[model samples]
Target chain A: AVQIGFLLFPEVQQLDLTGPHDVLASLPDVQVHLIWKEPGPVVASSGLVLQATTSFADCPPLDVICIPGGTGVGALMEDPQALAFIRQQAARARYVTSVCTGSLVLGAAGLLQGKRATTHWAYHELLAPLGAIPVHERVVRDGNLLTGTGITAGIDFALTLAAELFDAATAQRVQLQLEYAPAPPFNAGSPDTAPASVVQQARQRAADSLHKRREITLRAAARLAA
Target chain B: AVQIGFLLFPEVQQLDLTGPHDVLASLPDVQVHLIWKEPGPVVASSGLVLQATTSFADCPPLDVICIPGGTGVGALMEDPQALAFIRQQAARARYVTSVCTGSLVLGAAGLLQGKRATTHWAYHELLAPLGAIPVHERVVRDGNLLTGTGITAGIDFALTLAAELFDAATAQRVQLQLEYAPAPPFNAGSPDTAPASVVQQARQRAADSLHKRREITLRAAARLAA
Candidate 1:
């Protein structure tokens, strides 16, 4: 049996993991496994609790490893234990994938160096610090590493992975079943449509959360170095 | 506290319920309840199994009742036990919502009679047979009844409900946190975008599945009438 390993961390985005989990779960050949540093429940970025499938010590070698990003990413990037597990598994896996800001974590691991990757649009510049070329595409594939741009890109990432494994036809079929063709009814789904005032308000709300997380990650990185 | 009663049946579209369930579970003002006729886990029309929070006999009245659709829906339509549950619950709930084709079941249960409703676009016309005015829209709000278009619309439905129950600002914040900014990157989703060939294939695939479930539902309806 093939496994799709999803790294679980406190504060990881729920949809990033679940969105792709749903699509891949529909695949007959792939099993979605939530792998955490330890066993038990992993709380999401928004406080949702998810049960894990395997601990790092027990799960089989992964065919694919997915890292999802959210407010908690800064802490995750800095955590020595979490970084070690991800670097090890991603190094061994056939492919490494990430959605939203998750790619930045890949960069933190030194995996994205010199590679064209993608991350949450708002934080793409961070890739430069890691010595990676950040692409502005919704989904970017540089060799075996696949990265997605921001939140809802999880669907696109999953579908692209599916297309990679199965034929385009198979992925399209699954996409149809999941109703992947979406139309955001409102004009406010992205910066392009959201009124400048609303975007500013949204950014203001996120700025503080990002700063706090950055501090946590910075401390963790220091601990790992020590 | 607002009680959210969710209906589940065999082959139920898991996302219809699970996606919204994840969001509803986060609400402090809400208590999420999964109700079915018989106890234990109910298999969704899509093969996902979900545990019941309460049985029909033990379930309390609800402030909100959500019905999610899947291949099992046709069977649920005629199930005397299930329709009775919908009839009883919808009558008492302050707000009633249906995801995907779940609205058709409501229509079959006479809950949508003389009401403007919506469902997955592929089966929008079927609502007419159930005495509903089938409007092909993402989210249809008619008085106390709310209906959504397809599996993806469940997220939108939950957001809209949040907006209705709390405030638009709260919903916007949640959306931001979700990165609900969708960019699907595909053109094949519904009956409309699907090539005529593909739609025909899907219809053929659904024929036996639908007939089997619908038969069960019709028989149940008969028993109820008797």
Candidate 2:
């Protein structure tokens, strides 16, 4: 059996964790774990509560460790306990991974240094401060490090990792079960593809949060380097 | 504020609910509620635990009522209380919708009678028995009734609903934030597109569960007819 664990913290982007969890947990003989400081409820950014099934101290040695991102990244970047646990776990995990701003968290933990990674396009520029070679893609794989771009990208990220862990046939089986054939109602899914007005609103919506995260990133980078 | 409520039940597919919740919750002036018989933790088919934020007795009148599906569909189809709740809510809700096998629940609720709808491809045949004229697509809209194809379709479904609730520009802005530019590593998301072998395996994996659900569906249909 393979153990796959996700770092669970408050205000996390629920889609980042839920999307990947739904995909990866469908793998044969896989045990999905939501790991936190303790086993209990954690409130996500949307106010939805998810239960953390395992504690950092109690978690099994994971075959795959995925960190999902959200506004919580600022807290995690400043959190020594969380970063220490991530560093310790990554040392022995088969794959160190992230979705959305999660790559920023991995970078904060001093794990993405000189490593090619990706994150939400809004925060893509922050990766460099964390010493990461940022790539713009749905899923970026630098050796055992796998990072996905943005929220819904977690689904693609987990599917890709599933393929790597097993085979194309195995991943295809899961995809078919979920019927992952996507047809977005509108074509404006990306900053590059969205109308200029739509793109501008998204940037404006995120301006406040992104500004705060930048400060956190610079501080975390200092600590990572020292 | 547009209050959106998702019917949350034990053994439901987490993605079917979480995917839509993440998208709809991102909308401005939108408040999302996870509704159940009571407010508490509910285990998903994948064993991921999600908390129900509101009970049937306590939930506010919703602008949108979404039912997600999984192995739980069989239980929900058999549940008169839950069916009553859906019927009551859908009677007044601005939009009555579902994702994945959730349309089956709507059928069981007697809400999809003579309504054009869609569901997971594996269970498409069951819809006619429950009084829905099944359509094969990612998202199908019949009047105020909307249904999505399968698990990941919830994202597309929600984006489509968001566009309807507001406009293309509003939905596009949310899409940009989530970076919904999907890039599936494999193109085998549907049985129609999957290799014969992979499709065979997926069917095999779900055979037992689907068999039980089919039995449940027939019973539910009979009761609804009565």
Candidate 3:
């Protein structure tokens, strides 16, 4: 069986982990593990509680390691042990991946140095300071390193990753199981498509959070230089 | 505060709750509650553990009540307390909602009697016996009842719900926050768009699971008739 581990942390965006988990778990003969510092309930930024089943010390060998992003990414980037664990997993895992801001966690681990990546659009600029070439796209892949953008995009991220791991047909089957037809009630999905006011609102809404994330990103960059 | 309660039970699809929860929680002055039989961990169909914070009996008055569908719906259809909780919550909720196979759970609760609803395309016909008028659509809204088709559509479902509760602009902000720009890697999200072979595979893959679901659905139908 192919083993895949998702890093779970306090204040994760939840769907960043869940959307992909649902799609990836649909594949036959695949084992999915939620790994964290110690196995316990981790509350998501949305206040949803998700239980991590494996600890970093107890996690089995993984073929793939995925990190999800949220408000937690700021704190995770500043933590040495978390960064060390990510680096350790990325060293052995065939595919090192992320969804939303989780790409920053990969960056903090110094894995994204000089690598192309994508992330939540609001925080895209932070990639440059983390030594990553920021790509403006839904998904980006540089070698075995794969990244996806924003919340709903995690589904697409997993679907794409599945195709890469197996074949288009295999991933196609998982897509059908998900019934991932794209029919939104609004045309406000992208910054370009959303109304000017809404786009401004999104920027204004996450101001303080974004500032903290950038601060952490700069420090992670400074460590890489030394 | 807008109190919204989502039904949490063993084997729920996870993404169904997570998708709507993420979208709804983005709204200002809203409280999201995961309600189950007793407050504890509930294992989702994907093997992910989610904690339910409120018991059915202790659930606060809800402005919105939602049920998400999965393999667990068959057993939940045969559950008395679960169905009872749906009925009790729906009585006063401003909106009654479901996603994917979740429409079946709402039907099993007798909440879909003569209601026009949609579900995972594979089980569309199953809704009829449960006294629902199955509409083949991505999303359906009949008065105070709202339903979304399949898995990823839950994001769309919640977006629509947010628009209804507040305004289109209000929901638009949440959409931007989620970066709801959906760019899927495949065209196989729906039976119509997917390759014929993939669609067939989807049908064949879940045949046994569907059989069990139909059997349980019939029993719920019998109870509704009585």
Candidate 4:
């Protein structure tokens, strides 16, 4: 059985975890765990609360360790406990992976130094300052490290990971089980495709949260430098 | 501000609620709640635990009420308390909707009578027995009643609802923020696109759970008949 653990934290983006969680959990003989610093309720930015199944102290050595991104990831970037835990796990994991901004946390853990990675569009440029080459792809893989773009790319990331863990056929089965055929009614799923006005509004909408993330990231980068 | 509520239950599909939750919660001034028969921890079919924010008795009047489906949906269809709660809310909610087999619960609540609805592919045929016209579409809108197929379709359904509640521009903004651009590595998201072998394997995988659902649905149909 392949053991996989996803980091759970307060103010996380639920889709970043749940999208990939649903896909990965559907794999045969796969054991998925939600790991946190402590066992309790962790609320997402969207107001959804998910309980952690295992604590960082009690988590097993996992074949895969995935971190999901959200507003909470900013706090985790500077958290010694979280970063140390990620560092320990990534050292031996068969695949060290992340969804959305989770890659930023991985970077802060000193796991992405000189490695190619990807993260949320809003903060893709932030990777360069963290000692990594940032790619704009939906899912990026450099050696054993895997990372994805913003919220919805978690599904794609998981499917790609599944293919690596098992066979393409096995991953396809999981995709079918989740009915991952996506049909978004809007063509504005990316900045390039979105109308200029809608893109501006989205940027304005995320400005405050992005500002907070920038502040935390700068501090984390300084620590990495030191 | 638009107030939206999604039912939280033991064994509910995490994606069914979260896919839409992520999309809708991004809207400006929109409030989303995870409402259950009683407030507390609810475990999903994939073992993810989500905390309920409001109990049925304490829930405020919502503009939209959504029911999600999973193995637990069968028990809910025959649950008097759940049915009553749904019926009472459906009477006045601006939109009454569901994802996956959740449409079955809506039918059990007598909300889908003579209405065209869609559900997970494996159980799409089950809706006809409940006096509802089963439509084979990703997202179906018959009046204010909106239903979607399986888990991932929740995103599409939510965007559709978003447009109706606000405007197309607002929905597109939410979509862009989510980066809902999906790129599945395989074409096995639906039975239509999946290989026959894959479809057979899916049926085998869900045989026992679907059996439980069929039995529960029959009982619910009888109750509705009476």
lDDT order of candidates, best first?
2, 3, 4, 1
> Against the true structure, what is each candidate's TM-score?
0.81, 0.97, 0.97, 0.96
lDDT of 4 by residue, A75-166 (tens): 89988999999999888999998988899999888888899998877777788888899887878889999887757777887887888888
Backbone Cα, N, C clashes tallied per candidate: 6, 0, 1, 0
RMSD from true fold, candidate 2: 1.4
Summarize candidate 3's per-residue lDDT along A1-226 as a digit string, tens digits: 8899999999999888898898888888899999988988899999998888989898888898999999888889988988888888788899998988999999888999989998887888899888899898877889999898768666887777788788999888888887878788898877888999989988998899888887788888999899
| Clash pairs, model 1 backbone | B11-B44, B11-B45, B12-B44, B12-B45, B75-B213, B78-B217
lDDT, candidate 1, A1-226, per-residue tens: 6688888888877777776777777777787778887766677655455667678888788889999887678877776677888888887788899988888688777788789997765566567666688677667888888887645566677777777787676676676665556555344555565566667777786787666655654454444344
* Deviating ranges (above 4 Å) for candidate 3: none
How does residue A161 of candidate 2 score in lDDT?
79
Ordering by TM-score = 2, 3, 4, 1
What stretches of model 2 exceed 4 Å from their correct place? none
Model 4, span B1-226: residue lDDT tens: 8889999999998898998898888888888989987888888998888888899999988899999988788889988998998898888999998988899999888888899998888887779878899888888898889898757887887888888889999998888887778887788889999888888888898788778777877888888899
Clashing pairs in 3: B69-B102
TM-score of 2: 0.97
Cα misplacement distance, residue B188 of candidate 1 (Å): 1.2
lDDT of 3 by residue, B126-146 (tens): 989988888988888898998
